[PDB]
Design a protein around this ligand. Structure first.
Ligand SMILES: CC(=O)N[C@@H]1[C@@H](O)[C@H](O[C@@H]2O[C@H](CO)[C@@H](O[C@@H]3O[C@H](CO)[C@@H](O[C@@H]4O[C@H](CO)[C@@H](O)[C@H](O)[C@H]4NC(C)=O)[C@H](O)[C@H]3NC(C)=O)[C@H](O)[C@H]2NC(C)=O)[C@@H](CO)O[C@H]1O
Ligand SMILES: CC(=O)N[C@@H]1[C@@H](O)[C@H](O[C@@H]2O[C@H](CO)[C@@H](O)[C@H](O)[C@H]2NC(C)=O)[C@@H](CO)O[C@H]1O
Ligand code: NA
Length: 130
């Protein structure tokens, strides 16, 4: 499913992502836009590691979900990776909260670092009334 910007913003707000671990909703929205284009079906295979990034937040199988085919991986979110390719994003949100709590924090997300860091991100939430 491809979420519309404000639809996702509303959802994330409701699921308490606004200010989570001090991260603003605008940052979370920026992250989702550049990681997957707000697409729950997005997958990215990393041929040089045999890991896969899944869903709206592009959560990596080496550490966070079990996909059964990533060599030497762990499953810190205690979820099948398949659960991150769903229309309901409650599981993806719970996992993103776990991810941000690792030492690295929001730096775990490469697209965030490249397109959102050190920028004014108010645009990803404009006109959403969140
Ligand atoms: C080819 C490419 O770049 N593809 C991108 C994906 O890599 C990327 O997903 C992110 O992948 C990185 C690298 O594996 C991963 O970062 C790792 O995170 C783990 C878990 O937090 C770290 O291990 C922890 O380290 C701390 C301190 O060293 C320990 O205290 C702790 O015990 C460890 N945790 C666990 C559970 O064991 C790794 O050190 C760290 N590695 C690096 C190099 O930073 C990110 O978490 C992945 N991000 C997400 C959201 O899954 C994907 C998304 O950015 O994008 C592709 O482009
Ligand atoms: C212009 C734009 O919003 N592009 C979106 C892409 O960012 C996104 O591709 C992702 O790009 C990230 C860097 O911007 C990469 O870190 C990441 O590997 C890549 N994700 C995938 C799944 O390839 C795509 C993906 O849906 O959507 C574009 O709209
Ligand atoms: Na795994």
């Amino acid at each position: 499913k491809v979420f519309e910007r404000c639809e996702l913003a509303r959802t994330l707000k409701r699921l308490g992502m606004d200010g989570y671990r001090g991260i603003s909703l605008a940052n979370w929205m920026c992250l989702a836009k550049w990681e997957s284009g707000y697409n729950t079906r997005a997958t990215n295979y990393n041929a040089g590691d045999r890991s896969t990034d899944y869903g709206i937040f592009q959560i990596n199988s080496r550490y966070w979900c079990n996909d059964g085919k990533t060599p030497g991986a762990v499953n810190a979110c205690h979820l099948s990776c398949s659960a991150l390719l769903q229309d309901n994003i409650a599981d993806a949100v719970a996992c993103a909260k776990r991810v941000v709590r690792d030492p690295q924090g929001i730096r775990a997300w490469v697209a965030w670092r490249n397109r959102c860091q050190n920028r004014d991100v108010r645009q990803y939430v404009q006109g959403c009334g969140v």
